[PDB]
Amino acid sequence: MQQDDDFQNFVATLESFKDLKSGISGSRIKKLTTYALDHIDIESKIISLIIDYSRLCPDSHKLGSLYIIDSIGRAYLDETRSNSNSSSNKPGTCAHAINTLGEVIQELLSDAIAKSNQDHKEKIRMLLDIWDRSGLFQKSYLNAIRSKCFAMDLEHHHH
């Protein structure tokens, strides 16, 4: 519910992603996403894990970090948009959760584009359209998200 030992299950689920080669795990992603929906009161530790996982983890795990962030991120704005959780204390709601990501989503995406392969870049890209459909305010779509620097650091062809 709060700073309980409940966190351990959320940690072990995140760690279960780190154990995979693809870093994605749809049912497990939905497990900690559903417990986060059942209790926004721990959004603070939850948001801390996605930014820390997404920044440290490998390229495939970065793709999986954005799947988690997409699931918990949209469902947080949607749930609070559907409920009185949009009118409560700052931490422990989508208010502080989308606020925290709104300042660092540039780190997660820009690194993930530079780290992940073209197919992974596309999975993130459909996630951005899905976020524009949900209306998440983390639209820090600066040129860092285009990551054109790391694109010039690598070979490419389209002609």
Binding site: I24, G26, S27, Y67
Partner: peptide, 12 residues
Amino acid sequence: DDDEDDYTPSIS
């Protein structure tokens, strides 16, 4: 590897 690997969100 395990689980619903390569999960896919969607919207119309």
